[PDB]
Amino acid sequence: GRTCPKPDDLPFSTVVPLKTFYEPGEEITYSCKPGYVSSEGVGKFICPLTGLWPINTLKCTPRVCPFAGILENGAVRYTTFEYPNTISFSCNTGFYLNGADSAKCTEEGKWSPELPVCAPIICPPPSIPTFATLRVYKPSAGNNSLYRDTAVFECLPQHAMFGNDTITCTTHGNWTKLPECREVKCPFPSRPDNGFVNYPAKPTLYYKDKATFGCHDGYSLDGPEEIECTKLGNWSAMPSCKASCKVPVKKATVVYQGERVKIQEKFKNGMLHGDKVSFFCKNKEKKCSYTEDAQCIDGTIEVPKCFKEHSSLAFWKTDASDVKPC
Numbered sequence: 001g002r003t004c005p006k007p008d009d010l011p012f013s014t015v016v017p018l019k020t021f022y023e024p025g026e027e028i029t030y031s032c033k034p035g036y037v038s039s040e041g042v043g044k045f046i047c048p049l050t051g052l053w054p055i056n057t058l059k060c061t062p063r064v065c066p067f068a069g070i071l072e073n074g075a076v077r078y079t080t081f082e083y084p085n086t087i088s089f090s091c092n093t094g095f096y097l098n099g100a101d102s103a104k105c106t107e108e109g110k111w112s113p114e115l116p117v118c119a120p121i122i123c124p125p126p127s128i129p130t131f132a133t134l135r136v137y138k139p140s141a142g143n144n145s146l147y148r149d150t151a152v153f154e155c156l157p158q159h160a161m162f163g164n165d166t167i168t169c170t171t172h173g174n175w176t177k178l179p180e181c182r183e184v185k186c187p188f189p190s191r192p193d194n195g196f197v198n199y200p201a202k203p204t205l206y207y208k209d210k211a212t213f214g215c216h217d218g219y220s221l222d223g224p225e226e227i228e229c230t231k232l233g234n235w236s237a238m239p240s241c242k243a244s245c246k247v248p249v250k251k252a253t254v255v256y257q258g259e260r261v262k263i264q265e266k267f268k269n270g271m272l273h274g275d276k277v278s279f280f281c282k283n284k285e286k287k288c289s290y291t292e293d294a295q296c297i298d299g300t301i302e303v304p305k306c307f308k309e310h311s312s313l314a315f316w317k318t319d320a321s322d323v324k325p326c
């Protein structure tokens with residue numbers, strides 16, 4: 001036409017002055033938005049006598065921040081690297097991020113905040129507990145320790161450790177929880193009736209001291225032969241001597257453990273405490289046999305009622321340890 005119209009909207013730029021119509025000869029100026037720099041094309045335009053605006057060669061491109069794609073011992077998500085995009089940071093295993101985790105490209109093309117660096121996780125020398133010693137320790141960095149390094153603790157003699165003995169240098173630079181060495185003592189073990197006890201000749205008995213028990217002839221043990229002084233001050237177990245019992249009835253085949261045995265032959269020297277045997281009893285309902293057990297209890301063994309016993313010489317009847325049924 002003869003009056004030029006509103007200029008074309010150009011991306012990332014602004015036009016001054018901006019009017020719906022211009023007269024021929026009026027001037028408009030394209031200027032890129034902040035953070036965008038002008039490259040190809042020229043901005044200033046003058047209205048021709050014909051209404052048509054000249055073709056626009058101007059191209060505003062975003063300002064480019066310095067390359068930040070390499071983080072030594074780190075990983076960076078970055079995509080574009082130009083205004084106004086942001087980049088993120090991370091570190092590899094054993095490394096902590098020494099600075100801001102995200103940076104942004106400003107209008108001036110300067111990263112803000114400044115770019116971080118990854119630094120190794122370093123752990124201070126471990127502090128030994130009061131009653132403990134350092135069994136092994138290897139400092140990787142100077143006297144300090146790196147990520148996942150270990151120290152193990154050895155308690156002093158006559159002391160008992162509470163808590164795990166291994167400490168790892170963690171991700172946050174602090175050692176894991178430390179064990180405690182305490183001095184614990186154990187009271188003297190009382191001698192068992194009909195038996196003897198042995199311990200070393202010391203005024204006081206401390207941790208892991210062990211006493212050995214015994215019993216005289218005719219008496220067995222119903223506990224562990226060797227007991228130990230545990231971490232809590234009380235002994236591993238208290239054992240006692242329990243009375244062996246006599247063979248209750250001579251001439252009878254009973255069941256000891258898996259197989260069938262004759263009592264008189266199997267326990268010539270008498271039963272021990274807790275030994276379980278089972279007797280055979282006739283049942284006159286269908287003339288079958290069943291099995292009832294009995295066991296020694298500190299010298300007294302109770303024969304089942306159904307055991308009716310007869311002498312072998314009196315072979316008038318059968319020994320009722322016969323038909324398997326029932």
Ligand SMILES: *[C@@H]1O[C@H](CO[C@@H]2O[C@@H](C)[C@@H](O)[C@@H](O)[C@@H]2O)[C@@H](O[C@@H]2O[C@H](CO)[C@@H](O[C@H]3O[C@H](CO)[C@@H](O)[C@H](O)[C@@H]3O)[C@H](O)[C@H]2NC(C)=O)[C@H](O)[C@H]1NC(C)=O
Pocket residue numbers: 170172174175176177
């Ligand atoms: C060793 O330090 C660990 C970390 O504690 C903190 O770490 C520094 C980086 C710093 O922030 C400072 O304030 C502390 O020293 C202690 O462990 C815990 O670790 C948690 C797991 O990372 C953590 O918490 C997070 O998880 C919980 C549960 O999911 C969330 O509710 C919480 O918001 C966190 O995301 C926290 O850092 C820490 N918490 C506590 C109560 O300790 C650890 O105890 C310590 N060990 C020793 C022996 O001192």
Ligand SMILES: *[C@@H]1O[C@H](CO[C@@H]2O[C@@H](C)[C@@H](O)[C@@H](O)[C@@H]2O)[C@@H](O[C@@H]2O[C@H](CO)[C@@H](O)[C@H](O)[C@H]2NC(C)=O)[C@H](O)[C@H]1NC(C)=O
Pocket residue numbers: 230232234235236237
């Ligand atoms: C040795 O002692 C531990 C510690 O428990 C004791 O219980 C108190 C009543 C008192 O006697 C203190 O000396 C101790 O704190 C015994 O462990 C206990 O076992 C049972 C199992 O449930 C129960 O009483 C408690 O849960 C346990 N104690 C704790 C602190 O949890 C242990 O039985 C004792 N004997 C032996 C052989 O270890």
Ligand SMILES: *[C@@H]1O[C@H](CO)[C@@H](O)[C@H](O)[C@H]1NC(C)=O
Pocket residue numbers: 142143144
């Ligand atoms: C390590 O050893 C001792 C610790 O007491 C100290 O004097 C020394 O300066 C330390 N050096 C380094 C590099 O950590």
Ligand SMILES: *[C@@H]1O[C@H](CO)[C@@H](O)[C@H](O)[C@H]1NC(C)=O
Pocket residue numbers: 164165166
């Ligand atoms: C705790 O001690 C046990 C030894 O009984 C060990 O196997 C375990 O690894 C220790 N805990 C940790 C976290 O290492």
